[PDB]
Amino acid sequence: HMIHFSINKNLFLQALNTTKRAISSKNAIPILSTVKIDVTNEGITLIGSNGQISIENFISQKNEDAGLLITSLGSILLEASFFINVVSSLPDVTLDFKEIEQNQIVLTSGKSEITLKGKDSEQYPRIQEISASTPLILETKLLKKIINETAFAASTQESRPILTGVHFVLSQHKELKTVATDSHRLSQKKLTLEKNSDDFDVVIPSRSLREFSAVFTDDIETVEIFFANNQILFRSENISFYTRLLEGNYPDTDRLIPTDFNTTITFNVVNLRQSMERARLLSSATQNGTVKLEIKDGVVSAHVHSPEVGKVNEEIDTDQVTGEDLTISFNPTYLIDSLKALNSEKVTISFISAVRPFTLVPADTDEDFMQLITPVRT
């Protein structure tokens, strides 16, 4: 059984590019740099993986846009980057894909014939199948929104794996909590699901979640989620996206969130971001790298002193300041991250002291979106 099919170059190229999102250049298992191409009666399946995530992108014969004509079945491996570059370089709207002697594929497109050396696919590792379960269905724009609101807060230190993921908890059949922290700052988003589902408690690598947002384009309105202990699957009509879960107990984060406050300030999000980025230009010349907010009698100001380099003294305009005076220093990158995560015009930040973590929420909104930032003692 040797492969032979033809297809529309662009729809093919798109599917390859989606699949490539799970394929690294250098992998510790050499063969995982290849894309795997299974060709059956029903259609073509593109498989890619890197040991953390795997993508199965299927193009069905019956898809009108594919212009997919299948003559012979079979399987093959090609080095993904190269193959993808070559297809992309072909001149015509459709192309011929014909396997021949010794794992070679001839690509005919117009008057241009290009033969690439592939590999037998038996050596490619089969993907472990999540057991037939009841799916959880979420609107994808909701997931992408959770991801943008939380994944940046997760650690990037691989020596503490559990905090490199996002913690997802469904309780009471409809209460969804998502939290991420790197021990310095924290992000938490809570929803109520419109429909009830069976409870779960998982930790999903943040890198996997960033790929989820890239793999599932907005054309796909919902996705089905299946849970195992080791892994989890997101599936649309044509795409299956598996990722590993992080084993271990996620820390109890609820205790971390304060309830009573001495000072609050309500800021324009954009203006504050621009103030913190200015602050950061000078504070990043230092290792300490902190901005100092001074709040005296309704006036709020930012100060950075980077010896040898310069000094920032800026008054920041505010919608509202309540409570008592406060002087507090923090890493401005965390504040910026927090701000970039908001979709609201305004932000309410609430404080306790110069040494206790402070909270930030979007102002004037139903959203249960809560963040924390630990200040720096000085």
- State the residues that interact with a second copy by CB under 8 A: 82, 85-86, 89-91, 104, 111-117, 274-275, 277-278, 281-282, 308-317
Q: Which is nearer to a second copy, 104 or 288 (CB)?
A: 104
Q: Which is nearer to a second copy, 87 or 136 (CB)?
A: 87
How far apart are CB 125 and a second copy at their closest, in Å?
A: 23
Q: Which is nearer to a second copy, 66 or 105 (CB)?
A: 105
The tokens for 17 are 């590019």
Pure H helices in 99-183: 140-150
Q: Which is nearer to a second copy, 79 or 182 (CB)?
A: 79
How far apart are CB 310 and a second copy at their closest, in Å?
A: 4
How far apart are CB 121 and a second copy at their closest, in Å?
A: 18
The tokens for 362 are 């979007």
Q: Which is nearer to a second copy, 9 or 189 (CB)?
A: 9
Q: Which is nearer to a second copy, 99 or 149 (CB)?
A: 99
User: 240-271: string of b/e by CB count within 10 Å (b at 16+)?
Assistant: bbbbbbbeeebeebeeeeeeebebebbbbbee
Q: Which is nearer to a second copy, 51 or 91 (CB)?
A: 91
Half-sphere exposure of 77 (CA within 13 A, CB side): 16
Q: What is the CA angle 8-13-17, rounded to 5?
A: 155
Residue type, 160: R
Q: Any residues with CB less than 8 A from the CB of 1 and at least 6 apart, and which?
A: 72, 73, 74
Residues in the chain: 378
CB 329 within 8 A of CB 290: yes
How far apart are CB 62 and a second copy at their closest, in Å?
A: 31
Look at the block and give the residue holding tokens 């304060």: 258
Look at the block and give the residue holding tokens 């306790």: 352
Helix/strand/coil for 212: helix
Cα distance between residue 351 and residue 215, in whole Å? 39
- The two beta strands, 136-139 and 165-171, are unpaired
**Residue 262 DSSP symbol:** S
How far apart are CB 365 and a second copy at their closest, in Å?
A: 26
Q: Which is nearer to a second copy, 80 or 146 (CB)?
A: 80
